[PDB]
Each structure stands twice: as structure tokens, then as C-alpha cells.
């Protein structure tokens, strides 16, 4: 495990209030949910 690997280990947000976050992955908020 690198960067605590993918599975929504790509929630690159903005530094605004509140931010806008986009997940990368492939197959306020976000982040953990999921993996496998």
C-alpha cells in the first residue's frame, strides 16, 4: 500500500468553503467508501 491505495483514494478537493470534491477511482465532502 502506497498512498493508502485507490478505492476513493482520489478525493482531490478544492480549498474553498465549502469545497468541491471530485473522486478519481474508476471501476462539505466525500472520501472513504469504498474498497475491495
Amino acid at each position: 500500500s502506497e498512498s493508502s491505495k485507490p478505492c476513493c483514494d482520489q478525493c482531490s478537493c478544492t480549498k474553498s468553503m465549502p469545497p468541491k470534491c471530485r473522486c478519481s477511482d474508476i471501476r462539505n465532502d466525500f472520501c472513504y467508501e469504498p474498497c475491495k
Binding site: S3, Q10, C11, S12, C13, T14, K15, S16, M17, P18, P19, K20, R22, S24
Partner: protein, 223 residues
Amino acid sequence: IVGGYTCGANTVPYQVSLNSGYHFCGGSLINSQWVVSAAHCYKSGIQVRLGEDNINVVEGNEQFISASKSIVHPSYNSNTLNNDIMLIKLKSAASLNSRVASISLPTSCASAGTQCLISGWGNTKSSGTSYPDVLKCLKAPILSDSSCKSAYPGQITSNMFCAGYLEGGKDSCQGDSGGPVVCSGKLQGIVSWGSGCAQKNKPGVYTKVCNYVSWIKQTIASN
């Protein structure tokens, strides 16, 4: 800013606060009627706040001026944050002094390894919510696009740059956006994004303003 220090009252006179009823973003006074922020920071009925230190107490050097016009870059990509630049027009004309001073536009792009100053009123802990009322600052170099390219694969476009520590502990954070990244006394960046705050191998992403000086220059001159 995480891992920063308190600048001091007007140590950063071009630093501007955007308030839509609460501070939500930073900005930069590039001249007296115009302010540069990030395009992702756009909202309606924005109030520009000049000569700010304690953003929760009226200290006396403040100039609160509402925008009359806001222009987002024509090729601003909300999905990739590419071209994250916005220009804000003050209703009035700010008074330029000791503590209220504009920033100089870049004429050449700073190279990797140049030390710059970052600052804002955004979050101080990579973890949790804990928002200073005071303006916090940070000094971090411009990293290689090569290493910016390795941190965030496939997201670094030609209009962005990473400044920071691959190590973490020091970085911009939520509420810092739109804020100045200055280096050698000319504005070179705009606090854009990152993947968390001061996380390892996750340095901050900024807007390469040097790519936008003509747009700015042009626009400021027609509106």
C-alpha cells in the same frame, strides 16, 4: 494554512477576504478596482474585504467593498479545475497605503525551487475544523512539474504548479482558495486544490498566473 505562522497585521497588504455573509475565499488585489481569486470561488453578491487581519473584529484598516462585476475565465473547467482564474471588480476604488497594497503581475515564470509565500484564513489542522480569525502564512518552494506530475498523476495540466512539501505538515487548506501564492514579489499562483491538507506526497496545487497575464491585462482594460 497548515504548518504556517501568523503573518502579522498588514504584513500582506494585497491579501483580500471574500465574504458572502461568511469568509469563503481569499483573493488578490492586483490593482485598485480589481481582485484575482480562483474561478471555483464564484458566488453572487460577494463583498471584498481589505486591510484585514482579525476577520472577526473590526480593527480599523479595513475596507469592505462589494463587487459590481465578476468574470470567470472563458476556459475554466469545473471538472478539472484547469484555468482556475476569476477577476473581481470592486464597486468603488480601494485606498492604497501602508497596509492596503496591490500585487505585481508576473513577467516570467518562477522556476522549480523558488521560495514563495502563501497565506490565508483557511484551516490550520490537516485534521478537523479549526479556522483562524488571524491571517496565517507559509513559505514553500515551487516543485518540479516532474514531481507535481508524480503526486497527482494525470491531473497536472500545463496551467498548474505544485508548491510545498512532499512530506507534509505544511500546506494550504479549505478556506485558503483564491488566495495569493507570491514569489520574488510578483503573484505566481492562486490557491487551487490538493488532495487533503499537508498530507505526504500530496502537495498543494496552484494556478500558473504567468499563463494568464494577457487575459488579465486585456480584460481589466476592457471592463
